[PDB]
Amino acid sequence: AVGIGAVFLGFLGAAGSTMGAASMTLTVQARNLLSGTVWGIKQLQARVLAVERYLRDQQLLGIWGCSGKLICCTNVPWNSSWSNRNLSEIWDNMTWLQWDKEISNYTQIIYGLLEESQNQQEKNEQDLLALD
Amino acid sequence: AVGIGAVFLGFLGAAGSTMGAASMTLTVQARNLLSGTVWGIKQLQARVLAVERYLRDQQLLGIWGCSGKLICCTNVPWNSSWSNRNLSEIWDNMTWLQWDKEISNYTQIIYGLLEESQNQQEKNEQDLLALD
Amino acid sequence: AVGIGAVFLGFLGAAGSTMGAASMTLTVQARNLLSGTVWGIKQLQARVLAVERYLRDQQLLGIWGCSGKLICCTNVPWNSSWSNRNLSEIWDNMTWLQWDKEISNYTQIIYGLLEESQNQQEKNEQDLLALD
Amino acid sequence: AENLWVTVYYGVPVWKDAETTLFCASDAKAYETEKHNVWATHACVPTDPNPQEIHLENVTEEFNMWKNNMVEQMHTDIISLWDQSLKPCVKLTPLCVTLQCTNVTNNITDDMRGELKNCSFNMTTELRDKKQKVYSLFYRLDVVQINSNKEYRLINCNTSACTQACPKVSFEPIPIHYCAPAGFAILKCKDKKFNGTGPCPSVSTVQCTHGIKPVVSTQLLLNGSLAEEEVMIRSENITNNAKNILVQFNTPVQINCTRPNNNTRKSIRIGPGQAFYATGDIIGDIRQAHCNVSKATWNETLGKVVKQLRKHFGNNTIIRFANSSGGDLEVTTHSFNCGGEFFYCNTSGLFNSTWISNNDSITLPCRIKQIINMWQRIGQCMYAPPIQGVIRCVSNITGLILTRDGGSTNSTTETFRPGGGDMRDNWRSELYKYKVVKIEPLGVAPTRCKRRV
Amino acid sequence: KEYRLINCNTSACTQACPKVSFEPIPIHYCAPAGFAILKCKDKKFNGTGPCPS
Amino acid sequence: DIVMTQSPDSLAVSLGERVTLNCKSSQSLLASSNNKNYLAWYYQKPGQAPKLLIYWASTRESGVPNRFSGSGSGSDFTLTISGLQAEDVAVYYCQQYYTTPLTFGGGTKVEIK
Amino acid sequence: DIVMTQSPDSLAVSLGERVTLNCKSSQSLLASSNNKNYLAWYYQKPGQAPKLLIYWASTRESGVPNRFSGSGSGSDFTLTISGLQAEDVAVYYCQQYYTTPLTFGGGTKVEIK
Numbered sequence A, B, C: 001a002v003g004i005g006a007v008f009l010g011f012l013g014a015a016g017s018t019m020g021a022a023s024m025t026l027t028v029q030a031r032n033l034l035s036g037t038v039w040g041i042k043q044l045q046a047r048v049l050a051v052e053r054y055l056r057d058q059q060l061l062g063i064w065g066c067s068g069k070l071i072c073c074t075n076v077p078w079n080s081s082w083s084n085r086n087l088s089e090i091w092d093n094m095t096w097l098q099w100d101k102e103i104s105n106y107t108q109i110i111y112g113l114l115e116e117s118q119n120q121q122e123k124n125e126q127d128l129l130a131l132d
Numbered sequence D: 001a002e003n004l005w006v007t008v009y010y011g012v013p014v015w016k017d018a019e020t021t022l023f024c025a026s027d028a029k030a031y032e033t034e035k036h037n038v039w040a041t042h043a044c045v046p047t048d049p050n051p052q053e054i055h056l057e058n059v060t061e062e063f064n065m066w067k068n069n070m071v072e073q074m075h076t077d078i079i080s081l082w083d084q085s086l087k088p089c090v091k092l093t094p095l096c097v098t099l100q101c102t103n104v105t106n107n108i109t110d111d112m113r114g115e116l117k118n119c120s121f122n123m124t125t126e127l128r129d130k131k132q133k134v135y136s137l138f139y140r141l142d143v144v145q146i147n148s149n150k151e152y153r154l155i156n157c158n159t160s161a162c163t164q165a166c167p168k169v170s171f172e173p174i175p176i177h178y179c180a181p182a183g184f185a186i187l188k189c190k191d192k193k194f195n196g197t198g199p200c201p202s203v204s205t206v207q208c209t210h211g212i213k214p215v216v217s218t219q220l221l222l223n224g225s226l227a228e229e230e231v232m233i234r235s236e237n238i239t240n241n242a243k244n245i246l247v248q249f250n251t252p253v254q255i256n257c258t259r260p261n262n263n264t265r266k267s268i269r270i271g272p273g274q275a276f277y278a279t280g281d282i283i284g285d286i287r288q289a290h291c292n293v294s295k296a297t298w299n300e301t302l303g304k305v306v307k308q309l310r311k312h313f314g315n316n317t318i319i320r321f322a323n324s325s326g327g328d329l330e331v332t333t334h335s336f337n338c339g340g341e342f343f344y345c346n347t348s349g350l351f352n353s354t355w356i357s358n359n360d361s362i363t364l365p366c367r368i369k370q371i372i373n374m375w376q377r378i379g380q381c382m383y384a385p386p387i388q389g390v391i392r393c394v395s396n397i398t399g400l401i402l403t404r405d406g407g408s409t410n411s412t413t414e415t416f417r418p419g420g421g422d423m424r425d426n427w428r429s430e431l432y433k434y435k436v437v438k439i440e441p442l443g444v445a446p447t448r449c450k451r452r453v
Numbered sequence E: 001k002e003y004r005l006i007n008c009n010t011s012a013c014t015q016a017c018p019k020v021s022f023e024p025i026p027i028h029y030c031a032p033a034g035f036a037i038l039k040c041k042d043k044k045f046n047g048t049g050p051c052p053s
Numbered sequence F, G: 001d002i003v004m005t006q007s008p009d010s011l012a013v014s015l016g017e018r019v020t021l022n023c024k025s026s027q028s029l030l031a032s033s034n035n036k037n038y039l040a041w042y043y044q045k046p047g048q049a050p051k052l053l054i055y056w057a058s059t060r061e062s063g064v065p066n067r068f069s070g071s072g073s074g075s076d077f078t079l080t081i082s083g084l085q086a087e088d089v090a091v092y093y094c095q096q097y098y099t100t101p102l103t104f105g106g107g108t109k110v111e112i113k
């Protein structure tokens, strides 16, 4: 879902667009997330906070299936007790600012399941290599 | 080899368990390795030492086969002059604190072989794509 | 194209060798790129500049196909308006210091095509998983 | 197959020219000393002497010492590091006072002048009630008469309170290694006949620089780096007369320099924990500080530098050497520091030559100052304490800093004056080899393979 | 009978500010990332040799 | 470049007892990446092609018995003999193979006194 | 180790009205990774094997009705009853399961006054 258009398509440009349309511009927010006598200390701790946050997010990705995919799929199924709404009414109706609030309570339940499924898939892969 | 249990299973919890049992909890030590008028300099250099050590370890992984697997297999065989002991008497007998001492002398012989095998596999992959 | 030789084969050793021969030693420059009352501020900002540059380069890799390959191939074809020269007269004739100048003007035209092809391949992969 | 496919490679050896902040380093024996008896002993990282270098084959980079960076960095860092070793020291606020000065006890000759004044003054004691009367010995160059009675004052009583150089810290040179951070490299030119401008055919990468002893000398740069086989003259543009010519010659010229006066350091209590180290007695003869060079080897090295100067000026050129045209004290007479003592030595015996296109020793007299105005700051002078005993030191004249006069109206000759000027000409004679580059990975190149989906 | 202070010949003596107090407050020495701190819970441990707990 | 300087010029001893020899380098040859060091101790007979004795600055070659020991790291290096033989009394050499140009030592000619 | 201290020793009240009980910990049991907290509130009858009431320091067990509430995070924790029954008047317990050794509370014996 990308077409020909000459406008800049910049950082947080599609924050209000629906989340089926902001997904076609995710490398922009990924790009503009890292590079940007006493005050050098303040600037320096701001820069190390930036690189620490980037490393924490890349570590959360890396212990899951995707390390540099930027769109990755996994093997845990969507529990319908979490959001109990249709597939057609998320990708064409709501935004990420509005979808963030609706699963913020069910966040950190999902991440443990992601790590659990990735550890189980790693040990299944190790056993499948080991039986050969 | 994971079961149902409600205890916290925290950082360095299985340091004394056998290395076939501490391998089922490796995302914990991977997680708790990065995030944690003059003293800001000391805190700041401690934080950049932490992120520098994390980047050095991720770079040692990345020039090998696994970049975000956290369990990876490779194509160099175990030279039996290194440890000369059975497979059954490592994963059920010893710990990583005790296995660290037994191959600390043969360390840095292994890492060059890992880089050599990964560079040879990269050039074999490039030639196999190139002949097609 | 690697053989038996006992010399150190160090950092920037093959900078003047042809680029078909400096490609067999790329883990050396990848390795020696990260680790190396007022002056602690200068040392500290130099270190965070080093890790920021390393993260920017790894982010440019990661939004493309290769995240830890160190030699990766992609799906955009070489436009012959860029360099208009034979394949035999680059890998056996010129160096990277000399090839850097010849496509420095056509740089940043190529990187957008790399991100475009990687985003298109990610959405094609997502649709191919989705139809199954 | 004629369609190529692009591939990006990481770890590609290729650099651009860049400007970064190198960091200081010292040798392990220089790291061995402690407690700031020299400058900044624990601030810098320890490293090896002659740090590790590897040679790069089939490479050619153009260098320029004149538009080079990191001589600016070394100049700024040595100025700031000179300033930072003075904040614990003692300010001479209570010593700006009326000095009742008489002549030193000596056989006075009415034609010549005594270079020492015996000055008595009121000094505040450690108690804020009582003051004492104490005398000292100063030089003519450090006191001026304010307007029968003969009362003087210091020359810097109307510009600054003068920070005493602490006698704990020494001013000897210890070699700095300028090390590059990660991602940057340093290239050294191993070429013999390389004038610091244009392409160097033989470079080598190195992590840190070789040892640079910080010497402070206006004319006749001392303990420098010798040339390989012949004298090399180096300038940004020869025909410009406002550019200095840096002359580096092969075998060094041994110079001896001495103050033969045996002095007595005497402590005076200013206040609580405040001590002023003054001159007490002159034990023995009142003699003049001087220097010696060898007559024969100086004539030899002048013949060598005329032989090398005739390459840029034609063969039938008469080369003559005359002394400095004028200026302040430390731009006309060659300054140095012989162990915590600042000498100003007359070079009129050296540059007194003419050269046609066909066991002795030069004595040259010196003056000594106790208060100095290094780098010509607006409000920062420096008292330097006297030191005990006869002071002698041996050094190597390594090169010269020459300046051609504004030759016009059919100049049959071309004359050369010595001149110190900026300190950076002293610093460009050591970082003329090196440059700093930014190593940039992620090259990109075509090859005949498409990624298998 | 005139006196002086004993430190009149060594230093100007900095007055302790009456605003700031000198009471002890407990410090916790925390380790940065990548480092850990081990505590010995053994009873009969003289601070030398192997701690079993 | 890298200057390799052997500290004695000759060593004329008796046979049976041990000796020791040294080679100093103008540059630290210890490779920080491999953590292993770069000396080739060679042995040249009169009128013969030389052979290796010590590689990786410590390890003896195959065909060389246990009576040699390359020792030391960093910048200063030591070849220690344990027992002198009549087959051994000819010229030793130290070589850096860390960079180009490959420079050798001066050559300490050990003979019998 | 970790000391688990219940603040009252007993609580003899009438039946029908609510009560509240507290358990303090010598160490903050809030797991920073999971953002969830580690208390087991148990209930032991006279002469009976105990049963769970509150897990994850807040959540009631199945088979337990809506009249209980485990509450509080950090280091100090509160079991609040809403309505007392005759089936409820026996000993409560607080347990940390954050580390080894697993230590319990003192046991607040609630009976009828």
Ligand SMILES: *[C@@H]1O[C@H](CO)[C@@H](O[C@@H]2O[C@H](CO)[C@@H](O[C@@H]3O[C@H](CO[C@H]4O[C@H](CO)[C@@H](O)[C@H](O)[C@@H]4O)[C@@H](O)[C@H](O[C@H]4O[C@H](CO)[C@@H](O)[C@H](O)[C@@H]4O)[C@@H]3O)[C@H](O)[C@H]2NC(C)=O)[C@H](O)[C@H]1NC(C)=O
Pocket: D037, D170, D172, D173, D215, D222, D223, D336, D337, D338, D339, D393, D394, D395, D396
């Ligand atoms: C060009 O390069 C030369 C070669 O290095 C320099 O010459 C050296 O200069 C330094 C400082 O000017 C000299 O150091 C001083 O030497 C005095 C003479 O004592 C020497 O001899 C005794 C006995 O053999 C030794 O124990 C001693 O270490 C010296 O080698 C000493 O009196 C000085 O020591 C006093 O001051 C220091 C300051 O910290 C204290 O630590 C001492 O305890 C003592 O109080 C001082 O050591 C050095 O001797 C010179 N070497 C030579 C060979 O002459 C030139 O100075 C340099 N040119 C310029 C312009 O810098």
Ligand SMILES: *[C@@H]1O[C@H](CO)[C@@H](O[C@@H]2O[C@H](CO)[C@@H](O[C@@H]3O[C@H](CO)[C@@H](O)[C@H](O[C@H]4O[C@H](CO)[C@@H](O)[C@H](O)[C@@H]4O)[C@@H]3O)[C@H](O)[C@H]2NC(C)=O)[C@H](O)[C@H]1NC(C)=O
Pocket: D346, D347, D348, D349
């Ligand atoms: C650096 O050193 C040089 C020499 O080492 C030094 O040059 C000399 O300076 C003095 C004055 O500064 C010059 O003047 C002399 O001063 C006395 C003082 O009474 C005069 O009497 C001298 O005259 C004699 O010589 C005349 C010519 O021979 C006779 O006609 C006369 O009757 C007297 O006999 C003389 O003028 C001195 O000439 C120079 N030396 C030379 C060789 O020119 C220089 O000053 C020093 N630099 C600094 C900054 O001080």
Ligand SMILES: *[C@@H]1O[C@H](CO)[C@@H](O[C@@H]2O[C@H](CO)[C@@H](O[C@@H]3O[C@H](CO)[C@@H](O)[C@H](O)[C@@H]3O)[C@H](O)[C@H]2NC(C)=O)[C@H](O)[C@H]1NC(C)=O
Pocket: D323, D324, D325, D326, D332, D333, D346, D348
């Ligand atoms: C370079 O060498 C020349 C030649 O020796 C120097 O010129 C000389 O300079 C001195 C001053 O230093 C002149 O001395 C005069 O002394 C009388 C004494 O009363 C004084 O009144 C004068 O005002 C002057 O100071 C001397 O006449 C002069 N000689 C000549 C021939 O010009 C010159 O100073 C030297 N330059 C340096 C930087 O040393």
Ligand SMILES: *[C@@H]1O[C@H](CO)[C@@H](O[C@@H]2O[C@H](CO)[C@@H](O)[C@H](O)[C@H]2NC(C)=O)[C@H](O)[C@H]1NC(C)=O
Pocket: D103, D104, D105, D118, D119, D120, D135, D280, D281, D282
């Ligand atoms: C400098 O001047 C002082 C006087 O202010 C001289 O000190 C006196 O010298 C005479 C002669 O021996 C003694 O009798 C006095 O007792 C001294 N007085 C003091 C206070 O010391 C001193 O000798 C002079 N020094 C020089 C080098 O000229």
Ligand SMILES: *[C@@H]1O[C@H](CO)[C@@H](O[C@@H]2O[C@H](CO)[C@@H](O)[C@H](O)[C@H]2NC(C)=O)[C@H](O)[C@H]1NC(C)=O
Pocket: D102, D103, D108, D109, D110, D111, D112, D113, D114
């Ligand atoms: C003490 O110093 C004064 C200077 O402050 C001397 O006075 C003049 O000194 C110069 C050179 O030393 C002579 O050329 C003058 O002739 C001196 N002036 C007079 C009026 O004679 C003085 O000579 C010095 N000596 C004494 C004993 O006072």
Ligand SMILES: *[C@@H]1O[C@H](CO)[C@@H](O[C@@H]2O[C@H](CO)[C@@H](O)[C@H](O)[C@H]2NC(C)=O)[C@H](O)[C@H]1NC(C)=O
Pocket: D100, D120, D121, D122, D133
């Ligand atoms: C040191 O202090 C004394 C006293 O304050 C000064 O002596 C005075 O000098 C003036 C001018 O000659 C006289 O009118 C006073 O009578 C003097 N007072 C005393 C007590 O002698 C003296 O000038 C100061 N300086 C020196 C170098 O001694």
Ligand SMILES: *[C@@H]1O[C@H](CO)[C@@H](O[C@@H]2O[C@H](CO)[C@@H](O)[C@H](O)[C@H]2NC(C)=O)[C@H](O)[C@H]1NC(C)=O
Pocket: D195, D197, D198, D199, D234, D235, D236, D237, D238
């Ligand atoms: C330093 O050497 C360089 C050569 O490496 C000289 O530069 C060339 O000079 C010639 C004239 O003699 C010019 O035609 C070239 O264009 C110059 N090349 C460059 C790259 O500048 C230079 O003149 C020498 N400088 C001095 C002071 O001797």
Ligand SMILES: *[C@@H]1O[C@H](CO)[C@@H](O[C@@H]2O[C@H](CO)[C@@H](O)[C@H](O)[C@H]2NC(C)=O)[C@H](O)[C@H]1NC(C)=O
Pocket: D262, D263, D283, D389, D390
């Ligand atoms: C400088 O003067 C001092 C006097 O203060 C000389 O030191 C004396 O030297 C003699 C023998 O040389 C000894 O007997 C004395 O005990 C020394 N006295 C002190 C106080 O040290 C010193 O020798 C002189 N220096 C020179 C170079 O002549």
Ligand SMILES: *[C@@H]1O[C@H](CO)[C@@H](O[C@@H]2O[C@H](CO)[C@@H](O)[C@H](O)[C@H]2NC(C)=O)[C@H](O)[C@H]1NC(C)=O
Pocket: D254, D255, D256, D292, D293, D294, D361, D394
């Ligand atoms: C400068 O001083 C050195 C001493 O440091 C002199 O060298 C000495 O020269 C004499 C002969 O005059 C020899 O006997 C000594 O053996 C030498 N000593 C050393 C250490 O070299 C040198 O001659 C002096 N040069 C001048 C021009 O005065």
Ligand SMILES: *[C@@H]1O[C@H](CO)[C@@H](O[C@@H]2O[C@H](CO)[C@@H](O)[C@H](O)[C@H]2NC(C)=O)[C@H](O)[C@H]1NC(C)=O
Pocket: D251, D252, D254, D394, D395, D396
């Ligand atoms: C001045 O340069 C000479 C060389 O011309 C230096 O003399 C050498 O010094 C080193 C150690 O400092 C010795 O290993 C050499 O044997 C010396 N060579 C000669 C020919 O003397 C001298 O050290 C330098 N410095 C001074 C103050 O003279």
Ligand SMILES: *[C@@H]1O[C@H](CO)[C@@H](O[C@@H]2O[C@H](CO)[C@@H](O)[C@H](O)[C@H]2NC(C)=O)[C@H](O)[C@H]1NC(C)=O
Pocket: E046, E048, E049, E050
């Ligand atoms: C502290 O206890 C240790 C044991 O944990 C003692 O160390 C041993 O002492 C015996 C002699 O009594 C030696 O034979 C062992 O080799 C020691 N072991 C070690 C590891 O040091 C130690 O002596 C005790 N120290 C004190 C001061 O009581």
Ligand SMILES: *[C@@H]1O[C@H](CO)[C@@H](O)[C@H](O)[C@H]1NC(C)=O
Pocket: A082, A102, A103, A104, A105, A106
């Ligand atoms: C999360 O908890 C809050 C507070 O109890 C509740 O209002 C909200 O509905 C919960 N989230 C969802 C998605 O139900």
Ligand SMILES: *[C@@H]1O[C@H](CO)[C@@H](O)[C@H](O)[C@H]1NC(C)=O
Pocket: B082, B102, B103, B104, B105, B106
């Ligand atoms: C490594 O070297 C030490 C010292 O020589 C030796 O004691 C040890 O046994 C060696 N390691 C192994 C695994 O043999």
Ligand SMILES: *[C@@H]1O[C@H](CO)[C@@H](O)[C@H](O)[C@H]1NC(C)=O
Pocket: C082, C102, C103, C104, C105, C106
């Ligand atoms: C890039 O632009 C410069 C300036 O217009 C031009 O000289 C150069 O040839 C261009 N690059 C290529 C590869 O043509």
Ligand SMILES: *[C@@H]1O[C@H](CO)[C@@H](O)[C@H](O)[C@H]1NC(C)=O
Pocket: D144, D155, D158, D159
């Ligand atoms: C200080 O006094 C000297 C001597 O009179 C004079 O030359 C100088 O100009 C004065 N400086 C100032 C800043 O007044």
Ligand SMILES: *[C@@H]1O[C@H](CO)[C@@H](O)[C@H](O)[C@H]1NC(C)=O
Pocket: D314, D315
């Ligand atoms: C000067 O003469 C030399 C002979 O030694 C020669 O090499 C050089 O080219 C000549 N220069 C000129 C300008 O004639």
